[PDB]
Design a protein around this nucleic acid. Structure first.
Lengths: 155, 97, 223, 66, 186, 125, 180
RNA sequence: UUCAAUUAUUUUUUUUGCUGAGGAAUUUUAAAAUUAUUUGAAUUUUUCUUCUUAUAAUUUAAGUUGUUUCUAUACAGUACUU
RNA sequence: UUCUCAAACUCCCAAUAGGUAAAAAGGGCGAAAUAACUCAAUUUGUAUUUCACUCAUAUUAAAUAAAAUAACUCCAAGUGGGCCAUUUUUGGUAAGCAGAACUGGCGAUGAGGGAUGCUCCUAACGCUUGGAUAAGGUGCCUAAAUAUUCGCUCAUGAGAUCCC
RNA sequence: GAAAAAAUUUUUUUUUAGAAUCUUUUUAUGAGUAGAAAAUCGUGGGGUUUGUGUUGAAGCGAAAUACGUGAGUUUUCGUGGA
């Protein structure tokens, strides 16, 4: 309690090492808008549309964009319930999220696998691997490549 | 009466478990092949102690040769185990001073 | 009427023939695979090579701890694991997520690799199956193939030996069969149990955690 | 003597007792907070689409019905 | 000791039986329970549930709404698990064949005059036991007087509901908490 | 223990006595659970005093049955025999306490003629 | 089956390696002999040493071989010398001790018995580094040196301890401790 | 005089303890099992060898039955109930 | 260069705990439509819509799940003094002291053990019979071994099991 | 919609269900103060019904091979006199 806005300055709001005034051209230009997921990250430079403490490093969907503002739907736990909150943030604060990129790459790769299978009229599964239990194997070992271990005396 | 569908049947009343490994009919019901497995077992058993006594000589002569050749090779493998321990023990014992 | 009844008897006879035949092919194949492992291992050791035998794919996990005073993550994992009663055993398919789940509950469960004779014998004496509906299960002892030939008929692993086969080899349909089966509620574990605390890789007694092949010995006692 | 100070005890467990609820409004985010001008342009488009649709629907129904 | 949630119980909610003492309605739920169980028809199962349902929560249907709904149906057999009420707001010419739980006397007379059929639930069961080539309808809940009263606080912001108010008089509830000028508004 | 007789198991000997009625004269002997109060004996401190619950209940087949193998039916007038008679195998007569001797004699005689056992016919001589 | 009763603990040869990688396409093979009550314990002890010695862990390795060792002669006596590192209440101490047995496993059993008896040291706190056969002349311990003399005899040093049947509560006459 | 031990898959056996819900008018039925028959195959080749072709029975199927005692040749007794 | 440092200092920097993700009311690639937005560019983009063609799914778009006993709405109750344990922990010499964190208990709940005991351990309970065990024991009190096996130990106040 | 037994093919004896908050059957489950619910039980009066009364009611005391998980119900013996 006794809780003003930016409390925990030395914690979260502390800048990344040697990162001052970073404002280069590529930062702005991403454009996926109303469907997109987006991370909310603090910028050392920009104080103007800085979020509240809780929203740091969190991710949520963009629901509205303006000139250099972004509305973001973020989940917050409020005691007994997780609820969706309309977080207004700025363009400098929003970072494009990468979860979508994992889904998309998998969709593209699977689609290529599906397309290949379809051309052959094959019956095969495009589902992800489980990283299952290792099968049987073989190695040939000369006396030179095998080392005898034992515990160590104090030294 | 035509429109309404045919009568359905209630659950059967509880019976004994009938769950012995030696309840042969139930076991055959449950596993149709188990009789074949009994027959296979019986074929192994039927020969009995006399045939097996005759067989035991034939087994021991052919197993002696096989075991002795496999064993000499394995004795070299065991010696390699012995050699590795001894090599480490000596090397360390020299090393320590 | 008579033709339908006749047809049903014929279908039952065909199934009995198929199941008897499948069992025979399985019986040869499993034994042959074991014999090949011997041959491979014997060939490698004598002829100066190292054969690395495969991982065992399934694990029988037996709970061996009460329901009072549970940690919350452990409580969650137990719900998923399905060991809701304190002497439940159940088969689990070894993968990476399953291993980590097993790790979270580790001091409160014993586990190991269930050998083919044991798996059949345990299934024979303590097999129950869910004969009701999804989330309206009814618990019935398995004393005929017809019940499980209903449930597993689409999957074609209908009849108990095929289920046993899926359990043995970690077969193409494992999850559904496992899910249809009841989680086996076992007897207390006869002579030579002892030491509820800690785990088996302490030098002191106590079967808890991984005990590999020695799971079977414990299962034989508590059958 | 003193009354209690911090305690947050049992509250997590009470939350998990009735389960931790999550929203379920889902589709079609709505009304006043929608983008000025652009959504009015969409309303005009929708009204246009609706007029073309209504013209098709009225003609097609009327010709068949009578 | 088993770890099951809700001690392993399946606990059904809502009506567990029809609690009416009406002999005819008890006879009707016996009939429709039999018809549902034997046929295994979804139409019958809905009828049985709607017959069991609270009499107050069973709706009136407007005649205007009934005709408006039936417009695309050339088969004439309307079934309504509620009461059918008359309309005084339009000509209401086109007839139907309607089975309902209850008919207003004026509505029934109009439907009969127009060349329609006002059909009992026993007649419906007898003629149409499978419910095929028919139309099941419900009257609307449409925010009844209790529904208008309730629904997550009328005095909270961004909510539309009726509180208690006796607002036939002049000087009734309009100020502090309901007014942007005086403190704040909902 | 318990009282098996044929296929009739009765599971409760020793009807319960209300707690503390042994110590205090005022407390009624007939059983009452201390359900309305905290009481530290509903808290099941072993051997203090056993107390009843539903589980002791009779089996469904035998539910209200007498060792006569016949349900008791109480009779205060002769005409009440007439529906009862076709089920005489499964029911036994009890004649009500308040029956005047001339009537009682008539009822006893008629009941005997109707061929059903009357369990208090050997009384009120 | 036999009829045999007392004393159990076994010897295992275990061989393992690091899991193959792109970075190293030929893992180092590591072997050790380990005295344990069972194979699962033997694997765990090997893993504890693999963890202490190398940066390998169970998740980053593979088993090449595990096989039980059987002593060459069960009934021919040998003098086994064992070097242990064990932990006291304060810290760590080294010891090299000598045991006469027909079995290495029996010698380890005597060693655990001694560490428990003479120091109150628990199984957890002992680390066995090498047990090997030592020549009769070489031996340091006087208790083992005495056994290795030319001729040995005793007049019976042990009290009777008859079967359960004959351990009855009352005796007819006073007995004797032992015959002369 | 021996032919280990420990796993693996199996097959039994000596005494013996406890238990018996139930009662099948269109499912205690059906198949299985086993026996005596009958026909065709099989294969480790068989006195508990396997399948299926036909026929009968039975039970290991398909939740205890039987026999002999006794109470007692009573009318409430010291037994029996409580 | 060198010695020692800070949890109210930070080059670097964990584990644990925490967040987003895993496709059919949707997604693909296309055409056509609609506009008062956008852009020279009323198909430049946008968004929407109508038509298409088509994405795994016999089981699956990674597992696992007595996952609907879930949701959702209503009406009303009791409660608003808490207390105990491990681990982390602040004040105070310390406290069975004051104050927390996470979880589990007790409270409101017990059976068996811990001689004994509100909280420790085992384990949570319809009524009964039989079984086999848990914690825990097995000289006698007091139910089971005067068990086996190797050590150590003599004490003119020996020593004897977590919480204790 | 027929099962058995007793007799001496033909007589006799036992049983012979349809109450839809009911009956048959299966499987799972059973802690509990504050607190909420349901099913019961008992007391005074009333309408209604069909019974008990002076060859003795209510009441009461002692009880009952009694019934019900239980609250309680019912009954026997003794008193009692409406």
């Amino acid at each position: 309690k006794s809780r003003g806005k930016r409390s925990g300055t030395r914690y979260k709001f502390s800048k990344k090492f040697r990162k001052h005034g970073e404002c280069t051209a590529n930062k702005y230009l991403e454009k996926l808008n109303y469907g997109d997921y987006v991370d909310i990250v603090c910028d050392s430079t920009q104080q103007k549309g800085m979020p509240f403490n809780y929203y740091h490093g969190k991710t949520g969907k963009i629901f509205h964009i303006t000139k250099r503002g972004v509305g973001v739907l973020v989940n917050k736990r409020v005691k007994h319930r997780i609820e969706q909150k309309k977080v207004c943030v700025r363009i400098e604060h929003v970072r494009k999220s990468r979860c979508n990129e994992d889904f998309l790459l998998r969709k593209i790769k699977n689609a290529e696998l599906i397309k290949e299978a379809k051309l052959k009229n094959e019956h095969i599964n495009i589902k992800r691997k489980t990283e299952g239990p290792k099968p049987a194997a073989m190695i040939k070992v000369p006396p030179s490549k095998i080392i005898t271990i034992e515990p160590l005396p104090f030294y | 009466q035509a429109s309404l569908l045919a009568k359905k049947k209630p659950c059967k009343k509880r019976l004994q478990n009938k769950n012995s490994l030696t309840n042969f009919a139930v076991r055959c019901r449950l596993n149709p092949a188990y009789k074949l497995l009994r027959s296979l077992a019986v074929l192994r058993m039927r020969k009995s102690i006399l045939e097996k006594s005759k067989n035991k000589k034939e087994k021991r002569v052919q197993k002696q040769i096989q075991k002795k050749e496999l064993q000499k090779i394995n004795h070299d493998y065991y010696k390699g185990v012995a050699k590795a321990v001894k090599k480490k023990k000596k090397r360390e014992e020299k090393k320590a001073k | 009427a008579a033709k339908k009844i006749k047809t049903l008897k014929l279908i039952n006879k065909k199934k009995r023939n198929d199941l008897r035949q499948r069992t025979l092919r399985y019986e040869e194949e499993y034994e042959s695979e074991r014999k090949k492992i011997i041959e491979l291992k014997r060939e490698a050791r004598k002829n100066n090579c190292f054969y690395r035998e495969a991982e065992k794919k399934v694990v029988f996990v037996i709970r061996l701890k009460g329901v009072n005073k549970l940690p919350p993550k452990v409580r969650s994992v137990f719900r998923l694991l399905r060991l809701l009663q304190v002497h439940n055993g159940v088969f689990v398919k070894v993968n990476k997520a399953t291993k980590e789940m097993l790790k979270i509950v580790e001091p409160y469960v014993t586990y190991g690799y269930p050998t083919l004779s044991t798996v059949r014998k345990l299934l024979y004496k303590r097999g129950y199956v869910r004969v009701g509906k999804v989330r309206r299960y009814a618990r019935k002892k398995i004393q005929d193939n017809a019940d499980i030939s209903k449930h597993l008929g689409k999957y074609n692993v209908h009849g108990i030996e095929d289920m046993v086969y899926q359990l043995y080899t970690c077969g193409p349909v494992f999850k559904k069969v496992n899910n249809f089966l009841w989680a086996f509620k076992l007897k207390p574990p006869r002579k030579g149990f002892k030491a509820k605390r800690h785990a088996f890789n302490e030098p002191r007694p106590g079967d808890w955690g991984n005990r590999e092949a020695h799971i079977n010995e414990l299962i034989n006692r508590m059958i | 003597a003193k009354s209690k100070n911090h305690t947050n005890h049992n509250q997590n467990r009470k939350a998990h007792k009735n389960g931790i609820k999550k929203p379920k409004k889902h589709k079609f985010m709505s009304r006043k907070g929608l983008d000025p001008n652009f959504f009015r342009n969409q309303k005009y488009c929708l009204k246009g689409i609706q007029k073309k649709k209504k013209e098709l629907k009225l003609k097609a129904k009327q010709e068949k019905n009578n | 000791g088993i770890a099951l949630k809700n001690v392993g119980r399946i606990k059904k909610h809502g009506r567990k039986h029809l609690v009416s003492k009406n002999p005819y309605l008890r006879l009707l739920v016996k009939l429709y329970n039999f018809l549902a169980r034997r046929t295994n028809a979804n139409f019958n199962k809905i009828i049985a549930k709607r017959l069991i349902m609270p009499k107050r929560y069973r709706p009136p249907l407007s005649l205007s709404k009934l005709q408006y709904h039936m417009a695309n149906h050339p088969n004439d057999i309307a079934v309504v698990v509620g009461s059918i009420t008359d309309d005084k707001r339009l000509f209401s010419l086109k007839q139907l064949k309607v089975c309902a739980l209850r008919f207003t006397e004026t509505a029934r007379k109009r439907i009969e005059d127009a060349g329609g059929e006002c059909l009992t639930f026993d007649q419906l069961a007898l003629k149409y036991p499978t419910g095929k080539k028919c139309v099941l309808l419900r009257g609307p809940t449409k925010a009844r007087t209790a529904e208008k009263h309730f629904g997550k606080a009328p005095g909270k912001p961004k909510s539309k509901a009726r509180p208690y108010v006796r607002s036939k008089g002049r000087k009734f509830e309009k100020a502090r908490g309901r007014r942007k000028s005086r403190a704040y508004k909902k | 223990a318990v009282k098996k007789v044929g296929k009739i198991i009765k599971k409760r000997t020793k009807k319960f006595t209300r707690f503390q009625s042994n110590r205090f004269m005022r407390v009624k002997p007939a059983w009452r659970k201390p359900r309305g109060i905290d009481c530290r004996v509903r808290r099941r401190y072993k051997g203090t005093n056993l107390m009843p619950s539903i589980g002791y209940g009779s089996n469904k087949k035998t539910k209200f049955l007498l060792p006569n193998n016949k349900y008791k039916y109480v009779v205060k007038n002769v005409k009440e025999m007439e529906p009862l008679i076709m089920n005489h195998t499964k029911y036994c007569v009890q004649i009500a306490h308040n029956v005047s001797s001339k009537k009682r004699k008539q009822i006893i005689e008629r009941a005997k003629q109707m061929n059903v056992s009357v369990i208090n016919a050997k009384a009120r001589l | 089956i036999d009829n045999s009763l007392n004393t159990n603990i076994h010897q295992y040869h275990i061989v393992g390696r690091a899991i193959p990688t792109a970075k190293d396409k030929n893992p180092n093979v590591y072997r050790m002999c380990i005295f344990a009550k069972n194979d699962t314990n033997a694997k765990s002890r090997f893993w504890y040493f693999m963890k202490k010695i190398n940066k390998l862990k169970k998740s980053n390795g593979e088993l090449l071989a595990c096989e039980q060792i059987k002593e060459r002669f069960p009934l021919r006596v040998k003098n086994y010398g064992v070097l242990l590192r064990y932990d006291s209440r304060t810290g760590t101490h080294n010891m090299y001790k000598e045991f006469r047995d027909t079995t290495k496993e029996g010698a380890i059993a005597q060693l655990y018995s001694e560490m428990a008896g003479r120091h109150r040291a628990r199984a957890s706190s002992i680390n066995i580094i090498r047990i090997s056969e030592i020549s009769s002349s070489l031996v340091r311990r006087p208790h083992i040196k005495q056994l290795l003399k030319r001729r040995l005899r005793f007049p019976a040093l042990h009290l009777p301890t008859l079967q359960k049947e004959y351990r009855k509560k009352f005796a007819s006459k006073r007995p004797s401790t032992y015959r002369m």
